[PDB]
């Protein structure tokens, strides 16, 4: 099974203030479990998953101190980046970080991740070997030259191969409830008259997790392309997703068209058409 | 878990 642990860090510079806005979000198999926000009344690591309550007071204090340190790392790095690009402090600048690891067949390290971005675009990233850095621009070349000399990659490799794998094994064992939860989609076809002789059949998909879904419209085996027009996968708000795929069909011949839904957790792919009411 | 970064950019 492909298991993963990720840490999504954000640092937005605040003009006129010493410390930037620091947000650190933790994920286990694309599910939020921990969160830190500097904008909060009491800045500390808070549990976002129910199974995360099993952790002692010593754990939360240790993680909060890591965030307070990272808050200062991003603060100084932000100031150095202004000099590299000849930017002003009066403007707001964003620095983002993505760090984590992937699990193979059964609870063993596959690939280590450590990426950085400045102003939405790729800045510096750690390669698969976890020893070499890939710099996207001339300013990042300075960062690469610094980190190769100080040996930063060795410290990140030690975490990614050690601590990251060790803690993910603990979380996957502790979290069996919300972590393994899979939701099958509920599908139905709606009728909408388009213009005079043409009609639009909309195939809905509701209450499904994860978001990875496939909707295909077909006329007795032969599928329809480009004339389909589909919508982007949107969250319902209760920890589940929504999606629909329309089709331009003639009036009276709507029964000849069938919608097929493909999703993991569904034992057999859903086959459906119009009722009618 | 989180990791602490070493040298700054």
């Amino acid at each position, epitope marked *: 099974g492909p298991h993963s642990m990720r840490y999504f860090e954000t640092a937005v*510079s605040r*003009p*006129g*203030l*010493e410390e930037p806005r620091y947000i650190s979000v933790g994920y286990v198999d694309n599910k939020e479990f921990v969160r830190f926000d500097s904008d909060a009344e009491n800045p500390r690591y808070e549990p976002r998953a129910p199974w995360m309550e099993q952790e002692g007071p010593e754990y939360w204090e240790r993680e909060t101190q890591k965030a307070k*340190g990272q808050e*200062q*790392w991003f*603060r*100084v790095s932000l*100031r*150095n980046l*202004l*000099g*590299y690009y000849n930017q002003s*402090a009066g403007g707001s600048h964003t620095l983002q970080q993505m760090s984590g690891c992937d699990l193979g067949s059964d609870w063993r390290l596959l690939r280590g991740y450590l990426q950085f971005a400045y102003e939405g675009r790729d800045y510096i990233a750690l390669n698969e070997d976890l020893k070499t850095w890939t710099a996207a621009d001339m300013a990042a070349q*300075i960062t690469r*030259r*610094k980190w190769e*000399q*100080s040996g930063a990659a060795e410290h990140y490799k030690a975490y990614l191969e050690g601590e990251c794998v060790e803690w993910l094994h603990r979380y996957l064992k502790n979290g069996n409830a919300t972590l393994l939860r899979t939701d099958s989609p509920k599908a139905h076809v709606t009728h909408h008259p388009r213009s005079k002789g043409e009609v639009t059949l909309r195939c809905w998909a509701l209450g499904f997790y994860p978001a990875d879904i496939t909707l295909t419209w077909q006329l007795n085996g032969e599928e329809l392309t480009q004339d389909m027009e589909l919508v982007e996968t949107r969250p319902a708000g209760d920890g589940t997703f929504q999606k629909w795929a329309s089709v331009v069909v003639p009036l009276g011949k709507e029964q000849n068209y069938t919608c097929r839904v493909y999703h993991e957790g569904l034992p057999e792919p859903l086959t459906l058409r119009w009722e009618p009411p | 878990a989180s990791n*602490e*970064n*070493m*040298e*700054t950019m």
Partner: T-cell receptor, first 113, second 112 residues
Framework: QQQVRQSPQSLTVWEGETAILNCSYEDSTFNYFPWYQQFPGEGPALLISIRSVSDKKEDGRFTIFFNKREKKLSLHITDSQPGDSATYFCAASETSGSWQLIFGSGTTVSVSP | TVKQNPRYKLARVGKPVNLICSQTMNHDTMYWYQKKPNQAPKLLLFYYDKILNREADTFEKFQSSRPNNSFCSLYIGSAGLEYSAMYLC????????????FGPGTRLTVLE
């Protein structure tokens, strides 16, 4: 330019006189201005500091005179004594790098007894 | 109360140089400066807790290590003429406007 500019390079005053140590900056972003005193064989030590909001700040015989409009600072030593004969450095700090101090060349004062 | 030993140091060209700095005040920030005659102290690098920051113009010439909050080291590899200057170590309770406490300094001279 930041930079920091300090005038003059060296100053000689008599015992009891007032020693005027001028300093100038270019960047409007600078808000904190600490003055460091260094004696031979010893490292620099904080003497007196001023903020951009204030215009005087007195500490016994040592008084600063800040002017935001002309971007100039001056350190006045009311009653000079040979014990004040040291190298004076004027530092500058901005909100976006409060940890970093931008020091000036330094004025070497010599109080004649 | 920043301690720096030795007060003076002499090294040969191409030999490694290591300068030590003591705390006892339990300060979060420890700075390293370079002081040349008739020149202002130039900031080389600083350490906030375990985080290292080296200045863009300075980096390639200086390395640093902080095993604990009390000790901070400045490493030169290899030494060569340009390094001949006084090296001042500073300490601060925060990463901001608060006071910087300087040590006596280490006057380094590198000869052929």
């Amino acid at each position: 330019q930041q930079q920091v500019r300090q005038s003059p390079q060296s100053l000689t005053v008599w015992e009891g006189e007032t020693a005027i140590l001028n300093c100038s900056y270019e960047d409007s972003t600078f808000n904190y201005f600490p003055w460091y005193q260094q004696f031979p064989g010893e490292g620099p030590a904080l003497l007196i500091s001023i903020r951009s909001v204030s215009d005087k700040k007195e500490d016994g015989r040592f008084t600063i005179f800040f002017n935001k409009r002309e971007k100039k600072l001056s350190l006045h030593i009311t009653d000079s004594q040979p014990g004040d004969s040291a190298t004076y450095f004027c530092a500058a700090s901005e909100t976006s790098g409060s940890w970093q101090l931008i020091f000036g060349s330094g004025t070497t004062v010599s109080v004649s007894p | 109360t920043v301690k720096q030993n030795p007060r003076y140091k002499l090294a040969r060209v191409g030999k490694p140089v290591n300068l030590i700095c003591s705390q006892t005040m339990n300060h979060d920030t420890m700075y390293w400066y370079q002081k040349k005659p008739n020149q202002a102290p130039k900031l080389l690098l600083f350490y906030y807790d375990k985080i290292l920051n080296r200045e863009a113009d300075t980096f390639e010439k200086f390395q640093s290590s902080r095993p604990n909050n009390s000790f901070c080291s400045l490493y030169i590899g290899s030494a060569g003429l340009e390094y001949s200057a006084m090296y001042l170590c500073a300490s601060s309770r925060d990463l901001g406007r608060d006071t910087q406490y300087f040590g006596p300094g280490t006057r380094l001279t590198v000869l052929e």
